[PDB]
């Protein structure tokens, strides 16, 4: 099972306001028009690789998808991150858990913390073991694919936990669609509007027109011939 990322999964790269400007950052982003693996809650929660980092999304009824586990082998040999939502409340732990044969939220803890229309979106980065979580939530009309569109994900948390993650898994409301994409180090040109929200982006490695847009630091390109790169 697979679906297309489209232009989903850009996020604010740093804690800075910018406005009416185009800023070319390079960071771990979900590549434009890449595939994302597609799974179900019911009618399929195996461990997945984490690689350099994850984009995770869900189109769902309401709060069927509820959390995630991150670690190496999920079997108490080292610390392992757990993130949970119950009713209104976010809950987080990192203990050396031995997880169940099939973990669900049924209807040595070095860090712990608390705080048919739904698209959840998230990005998880673990550079130098610092677990950075970005997110967005939006209304949607149908719950069985990613929508073609754009909205930038904003920061929620930075966990300074230092863990060497290689795998992850989701947690869900057993007594409905979720999607996974992988980040890569890419130059993106980001359009910050008048109000300092990112409203559009160009993946500068997607196609030659996107190299041209990024060579010019511009989303409009006038007629011409542009020396965008040198190949070898």
């Amino acid at each position: 099972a697979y679906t297309n990322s489209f232009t989903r999964g850009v996020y604010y790269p740093d804690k800075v306001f910018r406005s009416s400007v185009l800023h070319s950052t390079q960071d771990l982003f979900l590549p434009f028009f890449s595939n994302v693996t597609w799974f179900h809650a019911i009618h399929d929660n195996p461990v997945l690789p984490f690689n350099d980092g994850v984009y995770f999304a869900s189109t769902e009824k309401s709060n069927i998808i509820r959390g995630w586990i991150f670690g190496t082998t999920l079997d108490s040999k080292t610390q392992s991150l757990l993130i949970v939502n119950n009713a209104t409340n976010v809950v987080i732990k990192v203990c050396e858990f031995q997880f169940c044969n099939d973990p669900f939220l049924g209807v040595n803890c070095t860090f712990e913390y608390v705080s048919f229309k739904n698209l959840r979106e998230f990005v998880f980065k673990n550079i130098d073991g610092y677990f950075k979580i970005y997110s967005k939530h939006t209304p949607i009309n149908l719950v069985r694919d990613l929508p073609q569109g754009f909205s930038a994900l904003e920061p929620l948390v930075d966990l300074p936990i230092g863990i060497n993650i290689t795998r992850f898994q989701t947690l869900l409301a057993l007594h409905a669609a979720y999607y996974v994409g992988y980040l890569q180090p890419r130059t993106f040109l980001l359009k910050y509007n008048e109000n300092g929200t990112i409203t559009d982006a160009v993946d500068c490695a997607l196609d030659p027109l996107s190299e041209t847009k990024c060579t010019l630091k511009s989303f409009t390109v006038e007629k011409g011939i542009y020396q965008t790169s040198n190949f070898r």
Epitope: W38, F116, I140
Partner: antibody, heavy 128, light 107 residues
């Protein structure tokens, strides 16, 4: 592989009501949205509405609003549609279809809406 | 949706080009093309404005830019005596068909 198997052809007066159905096979019936689509004789197609076969959530096209109704059942793997207070222009082919294969089984590897599969086309006649 | 021509034909082994057009009230990559031999139910040929359905011949091809979206049929065959429809979709749910083009081989 996948099969959508519709009702027989049907006949009614103007101001009456007709019912159409579609039994489904070869994929897990809940997992692909169910759709109804209409086609006047030799004409371009038009969409009538959709339902989720997992949950019964249904929405309708403007041109057939109030006249149409749709439902589906997971025990019989089957979809059903009604068209009500008929006119001669409702003489048409009618189709069940699906749109949202998570794997588009025997049709594509990475998916983007569109329609996955269609039934054989139920014929309807409306006349005095 | 606008679609043209109303009907099109040329010799076998040649090309036929169809266009589908609208205001941006419906979305660019959510565009697909369907073949119908008269009396059969329609069949998906192109999706993503440009990909092929599995097992459909490599001589069928879609492309588009901005407001204008196209099917080109190439190496024309007797199989191509069919009505071809675009459809286009958007975030606000509207599974919307084109006017349809009746394709033929020249005789």
């Amino acid at each position: 592989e996948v099969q959508l198997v519709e009702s027989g052809a049907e006949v009614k007066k103007p101001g009456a009501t007709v019912k159409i159905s579609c039994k489904v096979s070869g994929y897990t019936f809940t997992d692909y949205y169910m759709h109804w689509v209409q086609q006047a004789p030799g004409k371009g197609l038009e969409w009538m509405g959709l339902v989720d076969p997992e949950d019964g959530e249904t929405i309708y096209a403007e041109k057939f609003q109030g006249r149409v109704t749709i439902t589906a059942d997971t025990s019989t793997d089957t979809a059903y549609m009604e068209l009500s207070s008929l006119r001669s222009e409702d003489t048409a082919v009618y189709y069940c279809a699906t749109s949202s294969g998570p794997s588009r089984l025997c049709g594509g590897g990475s998916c983007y809406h569109s329609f996955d599969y269609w039934g054989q086309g139920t014929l309807v006649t409306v006349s005095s | 949706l606008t679609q043209s021509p109303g009907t099109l034909s040329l010799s076998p082994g040649e090309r036929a080009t169809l266009s589908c057009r609208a205001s941006q009230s419906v979305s660019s990559s959510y565009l697909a093309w369907y073949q119908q031999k008269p009396g059969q139910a329609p069949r998906l040929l192109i999706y993503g404005a440009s990909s092929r359905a599995t097992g459909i011949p490599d001589r069928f091809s879609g492309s588009g830019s901005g407001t204008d979206f196209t099917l080109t049929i190439s190496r024309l065959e007797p199989e191509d005596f069919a009505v071809y429809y675009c459809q286009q979709y958007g975030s606000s749910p509207t599974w919307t068909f084109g006017q349809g083009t009746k394709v033929e081989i020249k005789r």
